[PDB]
Design a protein around this ligand. Sequence first.
Ligand SMILES: CN(C)CC(=O)Nc1ccc2[nH]c(=O)c3ccccc3c2c1
Length: 352
Amino acid sequence: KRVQPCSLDPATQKLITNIFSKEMFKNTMALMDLDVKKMPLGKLSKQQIARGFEALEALEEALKDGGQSLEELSSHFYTVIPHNFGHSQPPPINSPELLQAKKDMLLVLADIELAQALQAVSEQEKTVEEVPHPLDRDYQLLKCQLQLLDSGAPEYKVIQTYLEQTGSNHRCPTLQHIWKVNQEGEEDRFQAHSKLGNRKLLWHGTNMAVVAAILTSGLRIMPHSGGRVGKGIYFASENSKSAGYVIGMKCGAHHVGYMFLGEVALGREHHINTDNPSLKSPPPGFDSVIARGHTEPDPTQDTELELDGQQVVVPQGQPVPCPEFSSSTFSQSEYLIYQESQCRLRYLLEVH
Ligand SMILES: CN(C)CC(=O)Nc1ccc2[nH]c(=O)c3ccccc3c2c1
């Protein structure tokens, strides 16, 4: 069989290599204390991950009788999801904090399986005399359009300014590339909230392990997912806040990482200043919940982008003190929506 030449540019080739890298996945599983030998990448199954959540639920039930002890229930979760702790006795999941930690860990592992199941070779490919370059194939598996922007791009500078003004003044994240994300299947559903104004291009820092899944399914509100503002999709107006979630891998000397810029239909905003991990939707009449931080990218420096005939607000100024929320429980703002349809992936950034 002939292997057709790759039609991807260096940047997009590098990207597609990283986000499907089996070494990158194993690294992530190792960073989560998971036994990579007892749980090989090719062994990951939706069934196993489900059995894991079942164990987490029954354990959650025992945290809220004559049932099963926490020490005993925990021991079963580690039987289904093999952990690596230098061959010592694993920790008992006896706290709500540790409980959600394992849920978050399984959710990430769930997106690792999604990428694996996605790469599955179908019969259609096996009955063709010519195959695409491995990278083209992977790129096509995402069913998502990635157009690399340049310096001469209109929205490039807006994004670059947005990045440098809301990033950490010292540990500056270096912009390398910007991709225009056209996830096909996100426009149709996003046209629902086309009558809904108040749009803002917000940050979403993600670890490299779920980048493929996000490019394939978009930002999702998974079961067992949570946080300080409940069960929704988390965003940030400050790059620095999102970057704290960007877990990247080494590359010779640099620390590669990826961030998303999403067009969020905020509509009527319900402002809170206190953690509320029970939220599953905004209060009646509201379309989004916003955790106002002690600071906010100077609203007077906001600019607007024209995306698909829509005016989208894009912050451009440094964080300024917000006295009205000076004693808030959030240092930085956390934007929330509680239905996936309100988010539209717009740009993918590669930072160093
Ligand atoms: C790696 N985990 C600790 C992250 C997790 O479990 N969920 C998650 C995963 C990615 C996230 N990205 C953000 O830009 C963000 C901004 C304000 C508040 C939360 C997030 C955010 C949260």
